[PDB]
């Protein structure tokens, strides 16, 4: 990482069907809005492609179709960017994305596509209010830009920032309530309106990061 433009692509949250049993005793099939997370680990840039439920109108094997829709949307984003902003490598968090991406990116022979064993659970972002409500309440597809490193890169490297983010996401994923406590060390801890994460000192982040690691280790 950190050397060529690299994107992580997570399709885990694209096709979302909540588990519920009706009064008649059957599983519901109604989806809710999802999203594709497309993330540059050097700069912190997130492209959030919100996927509105209308796109599923009609067809079957929607789990499988969603991998293709993800590939389509990644290709559309690439085509909308100047060549110098296009990724050289795409790393997919799930192996089901490899073939659909390969087929959708035949016009981009320069782009290397690979899988990964890295635990990078963007699904945890659905528990962060900024993202969760935006996704839920959308009435049409759209793309939203974010900076997942807030102002961190003013004082730390991309490597330190990436590690910090991964710890935050994994901790939120494994134990949301406890992670949120760890990330609010004081009553006065705040998150700026345009930031994703709390404003903490360097020293406070060291302590937070140790705690997040311990939480992940525990479960």
Q: Where are the domains of the chain?
A: 1-150, 151-219
Whether domain 151-219 has CATH 1.20.80.40: the reply is: yes
Paired residues of 147 in beta bridges: 45
At a CB cut-off of 8 Å and minimum separation 6, what does 116 contact?
8, 91, 92, 93
The string of DSSP codes covering 144-202 is EEEETTTTGGGTS-HHHHHHHHHHHHHHHHH-HHHHHHHT--STT----TT-SS----H
User: CA distances (Å), 216 to each of 39, 122, 139, 180, 219, in order?
Assistant: 22, 15, 35, 13, 5
Paired residues of 91 in beta bridges: 8, 114
**Exposed e or buried b per residue across 10-37, where buried means at least 16 C-beta atoms within 10 angstroms of its C-beta:** bbbbbbbbeeeeeeeeeeeeebebbbbb
Residue 7 burial (CB count, 10 A): 23
Instruction: Match 């003013």 to its residue by tokens.
Output: 154
Resolution in A, one decimal?
1.6
Domain 1-150, CATH: 3.30.420.230
At a CB cut-off of 8 Å and minimum separation 6, what does 137 contact?
none
Paired residues of 36 in beta bridges: 49
User: CA distances (Å), 170 to each of 61, 127, 155, in order?
Assistant: 29, 12, 23
At a CB cut-off of 8 Å and minimum separation 6, what does 46 contact?
37, 38, 39, 40, 145, 146, 147, 148
């Amino acid at each position: 990482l950190f050397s060529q433009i690299i994107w992580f692509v997570d399709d885990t949250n694209v096709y979302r069907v909540p588990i519920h049993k009706t009064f008649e005793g059957n599983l519901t099939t109604k989806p809710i809005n999802g999203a594709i997370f497309i993330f540059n680990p050097r700069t912190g840039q997130l492209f959030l492609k919100i996927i509105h439920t209308s796109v599923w109108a009609g067809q079957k094997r929607l789990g499988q179709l969603a991998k293709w829709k993800t590939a389509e949307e990644v290709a559309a984003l690439i085509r909308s960017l100047p060549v110098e902003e296009q990724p050289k490598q795409i790393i997919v968090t799930r192996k089901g994305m490899l073939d659909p991406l390969e087929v959708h990116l035949l016009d981009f022979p320069n782009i290397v596509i690979k899988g990964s064993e890295l635990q990078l659970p963007f699904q945890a972002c659905l528990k962060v209010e900024k993202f969760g409500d935006l996704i839920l309440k959308a009435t049409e597809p759209q793309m939203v830009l974010f900076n997942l490193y807030d102002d961190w890169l003013k004082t730390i490297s991309s490597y330190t920032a990436f590690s910090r983010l991964i710890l935050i996401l994994r901790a939120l994923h494994v134990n949301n309530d406890r992670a949120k406590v760890i990330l609010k060390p004081d009553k006065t801890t705040i998150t700026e309106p345009h930031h994703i994460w709390p404003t903490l000192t360097d020293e406070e982040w060291i302590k937070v990061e140790v705690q997040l690691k311990d939480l992940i280790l525990a479960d």
